Amino acid sequence: TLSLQLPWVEKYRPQVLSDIVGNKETIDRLQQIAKDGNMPHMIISGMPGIGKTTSVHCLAHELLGRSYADGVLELNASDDRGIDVVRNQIKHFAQKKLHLPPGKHKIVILDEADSMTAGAQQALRRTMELYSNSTRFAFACNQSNKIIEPLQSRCAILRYSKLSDEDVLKRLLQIIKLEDVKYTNDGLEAIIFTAEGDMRQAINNLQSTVAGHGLVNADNVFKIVDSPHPLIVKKMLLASNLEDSIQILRTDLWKKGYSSIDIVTTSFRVTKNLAQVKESVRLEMIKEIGLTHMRILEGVGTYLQLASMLAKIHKLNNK
């Protein structure tokens, strides 16, 4: 081997706002903003792999044309979160003179904006206030709560949601058409099912399946990509008899190499997000799983503790 080829995430990364299959309303708003100009300050939030960084990148490209090189300051906020960075480099770029078309502005992209420190986040407010007529800020984060309220006060807020199955399927079919890949409907359904609304993860799984087996079929997908781990745990707690829950814990989880701490964390998360049972039952189950987790975190993590967890949950469900 001498070299590798570009991954389908990067090779088929959209370069225009039309190629994005995300939320139609916000994408159309971004297209209209790019067509008209006067882009306002914004923060885009959502879950990983739904088209947040790509959307802002294509928006900046379409807005600035050939002036992207000298009009876009793209920094990973987690990479550069120091208050000194905002004080010196961001400030100098904001005051920098640049002759631009009468509807376009310099764009500051702050990727992973949720990781910025408090000092830089507070220092950015006056920087974005005094140079708001020639410098525009677009934050890309996963949690809006990590950004201070005054920072959110001066900008538009774009909450991206999980991609629907139809959009992911359409993008996947477009990729297969552009790559000439042998596929099966069951394989694409499995890819979507294990994607859980993350387009990047779906694309990566599809590319890995093609490179490893060649045929996108459900059997191959489940062989190379395991089924979502929380679903087995959810089936495990919701068992009617203790024997079945013990069997799932033994075979699907313990004999497959899943660590005890992972199992207890997944059970905690599933019971937190569970909706089939009542509130009191859920809180009592979380109590028992938390006690077992406390036992595991001391290094007592074995199969006996998880067996006791399931037995005590089944006692709780036994009225």
Binding site: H92, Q95, K96, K97, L98, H99, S134
Partner: protein, 257 residues
């Protein structure tokens, strides 16, 4: 288009060094007469004015009065690269987005072309009206710089007292105080270190020590300082050039009761 050629780049290097620690962003206005630059301090307490005439350049060119918004830190970084024996050429094209600094060696053919991005400085053009003062003297820059450096170690406030043709510099701090008394004298064989003073009214002002240090940091463009006092007006601290000057307008303290 503008193409201004200096005699030594070190001259502009010292000019930029003189007023780089007080202001940060300066509008350089270029006209057929020369270059004028006025900048207000971030605290709006010390104003910096600078004039460089057409006779301070080896070659001068201007087709229209042009404004250049420059950051002094970046300018110092660019000018630090040059040496003492290079010709410095400032070049600006139409629709100025950046300024080119050419350093040309006279003994070799090596050329160093640097680029500096301009800044948008939304500052108003004000007029520095000249009015007759009450006291105007000239004393060597080095001595004044030494007095400021010794007196700043006690307090941040400096009282200037010109009375009875005596100059009194007072620094009243937390630990003791310091007083410097100067009597003007005319020394024949070198007038360079003489003190030429004209006093009409005895003036009592008070200034900030930090601004005084920022002003004396420019004690490399001349031998003496033209120091002009006024009781209701900011004082003028001037360093004369071959064809221009560097003035500092320093607003005094509040002379309460």
């Amino acid at each position: 288009m503008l193409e201004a050629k200096f005699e030594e780049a070190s001259l502009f290097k010292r000019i930029i060094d003189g007023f780089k620690d007080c202001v940060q962003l300066v509008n350089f206005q270029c006209k057929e007469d020369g270059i004028i630059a006025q900048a207000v301090d971030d605290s709006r307490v010390l104003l910096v004015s600078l004039e460089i005439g057409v006779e301070a350049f080896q070659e001068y060119r201007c087709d229209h009065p042009v404004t250049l918004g420059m950051d002094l830190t970046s300018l110092s970084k660019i000018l630090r690269c040059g040496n003492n024996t290079d010709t410095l050429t400032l070049i600006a094209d139409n629709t100025p987005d950046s300024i080119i600094l050419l350093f040309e060696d006279t003994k070799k053919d090596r050329i160093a072309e640097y680029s500096l991005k301009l800044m948008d400085i939304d500052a108003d053009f004000l007029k520095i009206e000249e009015l007759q003062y009450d006291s105007t003297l000239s004393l060597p820059s080095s001595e004044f710089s030494k007095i400021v450096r010794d007196l700043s170690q006690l307090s941040d406030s400096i009282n200037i007292m010109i009375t009875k043709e005596t100059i009194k510099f007072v620094a009243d701090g937390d630990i003791g105080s310091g007083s410097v008394i100067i009597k003007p004298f005319v020394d024949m064989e070198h007038p360079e270190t003489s003190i030429k003073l004209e006093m009409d009214q005895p003036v009592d002002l008070t200034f900030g020590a930090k601004y005084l240090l920022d002003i004396i940091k420019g004690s490399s463009l001349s031998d003496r300082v033209g120091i002009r006092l006024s009781s209701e007006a900011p004082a003028l601290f001037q360093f004369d050039l071959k064809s221009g000057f560097l003035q500092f307008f320093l607003a005094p303290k509040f002379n309460d009761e």
